[model samples]
Target: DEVWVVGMGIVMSLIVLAIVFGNVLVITAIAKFERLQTVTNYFITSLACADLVMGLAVVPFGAAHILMKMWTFGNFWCEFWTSIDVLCVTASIWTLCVIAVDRYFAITSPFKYQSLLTKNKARVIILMVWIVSGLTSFLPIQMHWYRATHQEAINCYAEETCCDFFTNQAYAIASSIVSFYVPLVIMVFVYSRVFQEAKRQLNIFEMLRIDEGLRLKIYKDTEGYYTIGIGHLLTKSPSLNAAKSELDKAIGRNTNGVITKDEAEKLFNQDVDAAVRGILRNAKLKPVYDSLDAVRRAALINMVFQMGETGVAGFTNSLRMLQQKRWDEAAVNLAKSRWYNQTPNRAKRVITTFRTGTWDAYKFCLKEHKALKTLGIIMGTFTLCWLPFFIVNIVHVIQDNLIRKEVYILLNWIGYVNSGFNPLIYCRSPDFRIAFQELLCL
Candidate 1:
């Protein structure tokens, strides 16, 4: 019995150490790294906090309960411990669901997602998660919505003589369905859809792609070296003097030293589309320009927009390759230009698009593979840790005596171990790993 107690203590201590240290490392890494403070990572940090709370408040109490095999702590302590346990697990599950939703939105609607889920909005969402978690667990238990009647309750057990929430057939079924099943189903659905959308978005370059939505991103009137909309030069304009007169008259201050709203609107709505179209038609390589497909045509127009006709004319070999319908050679020639060196990331994206004839290559270039790998590891570890426990719980509901007590204890500890693995996954990131190593002076 002494040996058994010692072995159990060692195992529980190890679990506690891992959970505490692992979650601590995650929190520290996020806190130290300015780059990790993104909207998506904010959710991950919240999830880490939830796990940290479990490790700090719940796991130690759980270890005592498991080792004792009976209620050594009092009834008040029992209820309090149960509340913490329930609150943490619920929070963790909901946080994961939130993360899945966040990632789904990020991948599916990247442009709008920035406006939709800002850091302030993310904080509000996290607050809502905690509030909802409290209502589901702490508030419900205190209000006697569900009671734990037996010390023998497998998870979040209480010693009061009412229906045990996790063990009673009706109570356990509803809790499992609402807390576990619903979130699990939603996460699976959202992630699957996200993956499909990601696949499609990353492969759309080979087709006749036309992202007209990009027009919305163009700034109309900003003072810079270039003029309106994707850096079209003001100097090359055919109607430059006429448009300038119109703009000057429209934007001119009234007696009040500010232009009227009507004047401002008129200036903003000035037609630049026709001017740009005419400029494209009047370019040197008109025959080759006319032969391009919609996507390539847009790319050429964008290039012309960024650089004037003279700059575009300088890409002699590249233009010749394009005229010859040698996309690969055109792309290579384009990469060899000074423009590629000036903006390597943007250049690589366009070059890949030209080579592959796909618009999706741009999105692929935006992906942070390291961050993605970290996300995958977190999700995979969380699933692996909790899946067996859920299966066992379902089996327990069907046949209460089928699973051994030791097996149940092991599965419960495995779930706690997931908290530990999260920080380990964070450390896999080179930035986080370096930061962590520096923190420890190793």
Candidate 2:
């Protein structure tokens, strides 16, 4: 026991330092930089605050617990730590959901958005977010309702990684609803609605532009000239060399390789034709366009889409079953659910790449793959930080044993890492650089 305490003492000290240093840099950058003060910054600040709490209040004591595993801090410390852990995490997640919603509102209703998303309102919502998150974290502690437990004579084991759960099936189900399922459902619903509305508005814009007669006449006249030019090019069927020469002559390329004014006019006219079509297409969608909302919806969809319908259904049902304290049923349902329904080919590919140290190579190939890269990074971060704990717990059950109790004790500390990394990426990303700079200055 003493040895466990001593070993964890060193680990905790190092982790505390990492958390503090990393988070302080991120928080300071965001706070001082006027450019970083966007809605996304709100999320980043939330993440930093959460990680700050973990570093200062949560991780240090967690280290103490691993070193001295009998919960020497008494029931009050246990409840307080658990509340902080849950509140911060839930706050982070809910903030993400809100950001997605804000994005949807901004894009789908750009004109009206000023009225809807005023600075004051955003601050109010953020305040609500913290209060609600705190309330959620505290609720279970106050009611003694968290995870499920069993009576083992004088030694009831409520193996909560963080909080206590009542022994009844009802309490288990309630905890699942409050902590996990409800939040997940709200995110899915709001994002879906946002996407739907945005798409609808985009369609309307396209229709209005298409119906404008004067615009169509001008587009047609310009398009006719471009079409004649294209037709001439096709009929002549000039070789690349011939085309280049003609282009040079038409542009009256001087010694400097600059095109003549006449050639510029011809090319400009051709460009005008192409640009007109592009404008027409885009104008058609202008009424319906909602860049911020569409991107946000797509991001949310990308985040959860891999879950698919069956995975979602199964997960939701499992939560309900957990609430019912139907542990056997919950376990059975989870197994049957399409969660681990990995194909041999896919599993083999993943395992082989991981074994061969080629996982990073494959990931690098996808690093610039846009939405896929973003989704992959987000999911991978979550899985890397959290899934191991669940998988380890499952393994412990199967083996009827515990492994590195110290590791288990330190595992939640990974949240500090997870929470700390987001702001680093978000603030430094090219998309936010200019805006963040401006916001910070303001």
Query: In model 2, how large is the Cα lDDT of residue 137?
Result: 78
- Mind giving the per-residue lDDT tens digits that candidate 2 earns over 1-442? 7776678677668778867766676677667766656655555566677778878887777666655544666566777887887677677666656655665565456552222466667778888988977887787666766534545411423333333322354543454455544654565566556544444443211211221111100111112221112122211332444444554554456312233334434653554344333323543222221222332222212112223233333356654543444545654655554433533332232223223322321231211123223423443464467546545544554463568765654465665567556544554355445544554465
Model 1: per-residue Cα lDDT over 326-437, one tens digit each: 9999998898888888767656766776666656544423224335546656766787888798778878877877778778778877888887778777766777778788
Tell me the TM-score of model 2: 0.50
lDDT of each: 0.65, 0.49
**Candidate 2: where is the Cα deviation over 4 Å?**
1-8, 110-116, 146-169, 185-274, 277-380, 387-416, 431-442
TM-scores, one per candidate: 0.61, 0.50
Give candidate 2's root-mean-square deviation (CA, Å).
Answer: 18.5
Task: Name the regions of candidate 1 deviating beyond 4 angstroms.
Answer: 110-115, 148-166, 203-369
**Who wins the TM-score comparison?**
1
Q: Please report how far candidate 2 places residue 31 from its true position, in Å.
A: 2.0
